């Protein structure tokens, strides 16, 4: 039946990190051999399984969250980590059971003017539940008098966008991330 992994990995438009797209995978046969024959920059890290042992298993439901983050924030996409991407954008749970796949895209997400299409939620009231998604652009009041809708001055705009110029450093280029999370799907 050949589970759609090319529908998640090869999708050209990856959503922003605050609004990561989740693709339910079920009722098929997943061939994981296209996930360890990789090009030499991929970062196939699994938490709870091992990469060479994914074929001889069956999972109930497989979820594939995909987004775009900075290079030094791939470390934030890990179970039980605290930063900005983990705290306010994408919290993996404490008991993670899947794999975290990230590759360099200094291409594909990088204009010479800089692609401001990718946004990360810099300010939030509270930290996120695991696998929670807060897509709203609501103004976060951060001090004395919470006013109606005035922008700025302790009434900030939360979703500050990245800047992804191709002359930035290795830890700042946009690293496309796909997070597999784990009976129907088999091998």
């Amino acid at each position: 039946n050949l589970c759609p992994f090319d529908e998640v990995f090869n999708a050209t438009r990856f959503a922003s990190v605050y609004a990561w797209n989740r693709k339910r995978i079920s009722n098929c046969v997943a061939d994981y051999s296209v996930l360890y024959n990789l090009a030499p920059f991929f970062t196939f890290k699994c938490y709870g399984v091992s990469p060479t042992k994914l074929n001889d298993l069956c999972f109930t439901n497989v979820y594939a969250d995909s987004f775009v983050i900075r290079g030094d924030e791939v470390r934030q996409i890990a179970p039980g980590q605290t930063g900005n991407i983990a705290d306010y954008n994408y919290k993996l749970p404490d008991d993670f059971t899947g794999c975290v796949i990230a590759w360099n895209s200094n291409k594909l997400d990088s204009k010479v003017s800089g692609n401001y299409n990718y946004l990360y939620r810099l300010f939030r009231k509270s930290n996120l539940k695991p696998f929670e998604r807060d897509i709203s652009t609501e103004i976060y009041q951060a001090g004395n008098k919470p006013c109606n809708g005035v922008a700025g001055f302790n009434c900030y705009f939360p979703l500050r966008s990245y800047s992804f110029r191709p002359t930035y450093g290795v830890g700042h280029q946009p690293y496309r991330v796909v997070v597999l999370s784990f009976a129907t799907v088999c091998g």
Epitope: A11, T12, A15, A39, W103, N104, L108
Partner: antibody, heavy 126, light 104 residues
């Protein structure tokens, strides 16, 4: 950059096309090449894509097993091979570029499509 | 698979909104081609927001949702041509074109 096409031709239902796309100028091992046909007065519809470095072929879902492309590194050209014409398969065959200068071999999720430097087009008649 | 209105009609100076809707387009770029009747199509509009060189600064694009739109502000008399949207399938294979909207 420019892409050279074959001439107009009239065929019979059976052995049909070795239509050629002689490319020039650009580095041939960089961009994909898409083939698109158009029935006269109808919408464009996409047939197949070829990687000139031999890294894979992919043809359309409703045209599978009937059309096959053929690469050639030496002459910097790419061919088709379709068999068994009908009146449905009377069209103008467009060879196109891909408009993506990939430097490092393939980052996953390149914007394939974006057919920029379309060839002059050649015609099949049944 | 990508569906598109068959034709639109416009008088010059107005605003024409060509639209393209597809179920396999939350995650794929949309590339617009402007085929005048008789010759090979040209990429008029690409990657949902970007503009190739050789195009006047009038051809915009928007893909808010799963329905890409092109917008012509101040249609002139030489923009009477077909407008095929494009995508792929949801993976990247089997590229699909559109309905073939005629602009008059």
């Amino acid at each position: 950059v420019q892409l050279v096409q074959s001439g107009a031709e009239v065929k019979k239902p059976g052995a049909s096309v070795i239509v050629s796309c002689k490319a020039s100028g650009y580095r041939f091992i960089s961009h994909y090449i898409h083939w698109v046909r158009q029935a006269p007065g109808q919408g464009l519809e996409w047939m197949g894509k070829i990687d000139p470095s031999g890294r894979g072929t992919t043809y359309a879902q409703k045209l599978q097993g009937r059309v096959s492309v053929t690469r050639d590194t030496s002459t910097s050209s790419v061919y088709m091979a379709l068999s068994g014409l009908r009146s449905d398969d009377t069209a103008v065959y467009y060879c196109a570029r891909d408009r993506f200068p990939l430097s490092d071999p393939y980052v996953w999720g390149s914007p394939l499509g974006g057919l920029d430097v379309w060839g002059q087009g050649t015609t099949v008649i049944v | 698979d990508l569906t598109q209105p068959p034709s639109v009609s416009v008088s010059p100076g107005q605003t024409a909104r060509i639209t393209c809707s597809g179920d396999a387009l939350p995650s794929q770029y949309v590339y617009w081609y402007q085929q005048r009747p008789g010759q090979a199509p040209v990429l008029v509009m690409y990657k949902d927001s970007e503009r190739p060189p050789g195009i006047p600064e009038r051809f915009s694009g928007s893909t808010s949702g799963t329905t890409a739109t092109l917008t012509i502000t101040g249609v002139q008399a030489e923009d009477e041509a077909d407008y095929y949207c494009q995508s792929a399938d949801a993976s990247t294979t089997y590229h699909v074109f559109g309905g073939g909207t005629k602009v008059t």
